[PDB]
């Protein structure tokens, strides 16, 4: 009751920090994603844009192997044509906005690799379940 | 023959029945929750209220350990300050509206307990997965 617990900022709090300081709390930006006669359609087209951009990322998240785990390993290797950076730097030197600039060409190649690497593991799980 | 209309009830069919017969069929209340120029905007503002109140309970469900499993055990204990009743009744004496009157003060403390009991299990599961 003395109130001694630790608090870790709030929305977009670690948005400039390094990866080693950004991955402790990702959930705070996660939970503020659904709740929070002509000016009702500015309410309507803000609501069906909010629920639309929530469902598109929850669907691209949903169709990989990661239902709601929010951080998950996968099986695809890291081709050095994507980033060519050292591993020991890019988790404590840089920050996320330089990464999103540093990789934005190579997205939609990674998402197709992730979907095929999930569906191949999916049918191989089915082929495992089929033999027994 | 096989197949009769006696025990195959409908929407809100067991709404007066006991907990042991209402938890038998929860899907019937589940499926009638989403489907079923100025009187079209009363359709629009009814639709985006239906899909909004579906996503809010599916989000409060989502952030616990129960993604879409619809019946799930958890790890938090049952503090007897809430109900203090014996178990052998609460599957055959009351009905659901009698439970909901009997507990309605104690919601939103329990809902705060489940999120912390999930997210503690989430990062402790992650710390278990990181070392191996």
């Amino acid at each position, epitope marked *: *009751a*003395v109130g*001694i*617990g630790a*608090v*870790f*900022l709030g929305f977009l709090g670690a948005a400039g920090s390094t990866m080693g300081a950004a991955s402790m709390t990702l959930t705070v930006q996660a939970r503020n994603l659904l709740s929070g006669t002509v000016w009702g359609i500015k309410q309507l087209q803000a609501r069906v844009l909010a629920v639309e951009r929530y469902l598109r990322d929850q669907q691209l998240l949903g169709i990989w192997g990661c239902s709601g785990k929010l951080i998950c390993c996968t099986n695809v290797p890291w081709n050095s044509s994507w980033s060519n950076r050292n591993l020991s730097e890019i988790w404590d030197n840089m920050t996320w906005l330089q990464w999103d600039k540093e990789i934005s060409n190579y997205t939609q190649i990674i998402y197709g690799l992730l979907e095929e690497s999930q569906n191949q593991q999916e049918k191989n799980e089915q082929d495992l379940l089929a033999l027994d | 023959a096989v197949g009769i209309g006696a025990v195959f009830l409908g929407f809100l069919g067991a709404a007066g029945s006991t907990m042991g017969a209402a938890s038998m069929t929860l899907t019937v209340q589940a499926r009638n929750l989403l489907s079923g120029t100025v009187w079209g905007i009363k359709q629009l503002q009814a639709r985006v209220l239906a899909v909004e109140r579906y996503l809010r309970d599916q989000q409060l469900l989502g952030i616990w350990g129960c993604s879409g499993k619809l019946i799930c055990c958890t790890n938090v*204990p049952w503090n007897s300050s809430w109900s203090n009743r014996n178990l052998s009744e609460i599957w055959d004496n009351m009905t659901w509206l009698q439970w909901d009157k009997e507990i309605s003060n104690y919601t939103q403390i329990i809902y705060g*307990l489940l999120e*912390e009991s999930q997210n503690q299990q989430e990062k402790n599961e992650q710390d278990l997965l990181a070392l191996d």
Partner: antibody
Amino acid sequence: EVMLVESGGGLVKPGGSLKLSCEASGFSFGFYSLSWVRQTPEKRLEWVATIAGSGVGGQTYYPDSVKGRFTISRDNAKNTLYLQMSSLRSEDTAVFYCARHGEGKYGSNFAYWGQGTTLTVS
Amino acid sequence: DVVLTQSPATLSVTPGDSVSLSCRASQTISDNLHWYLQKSHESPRLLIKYSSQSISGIPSRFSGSGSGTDFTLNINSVETEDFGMYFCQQTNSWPLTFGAGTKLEL
């Protein structure tokens, strides 16, 4: 992982001064409230000092028996906790533990304990 | 100050039996109660936080209960590794105080 390693313990004459250190790793140091708690040779546990974390308000707390004598401090840039002791008494003799608290409302508990450093005042 | 009274002070039990340890507060600490085990030559380790919620890594045989001033730690099949000194702790008010501990012997 979370590491807390205390140093600086020793044999001190009464009336003397001694600075303890606690080196922490594995967490965002400044955000957590940290404490020193001591365990007496008869094994009793006595809270000694607390300094709140950066998002906790950063204040210090002491029991009356040590106020004006004991000082808890932190150097967040180096992830180190300090305990400054002055006007030491023979009753201060104990193993001193560095401890890290939990998170949020249910985080006033001690979450991590150090190995301890021994202070003997005689 | 809140006085925490742990009972019994010392207790010898055979491995496999179950025990109930009492902690009584001089004022209400309704959910402010944590349990720690300190085995010989070791630092204390948190077992149970805020009366009853279990902690990852603590065995399921450890259970807590109680509300207000009266709290109980159940150990429902005691193992050899469980023997040691047991402390309760309150965070309801300054200064922080401990119970005297139950020492569990084999």
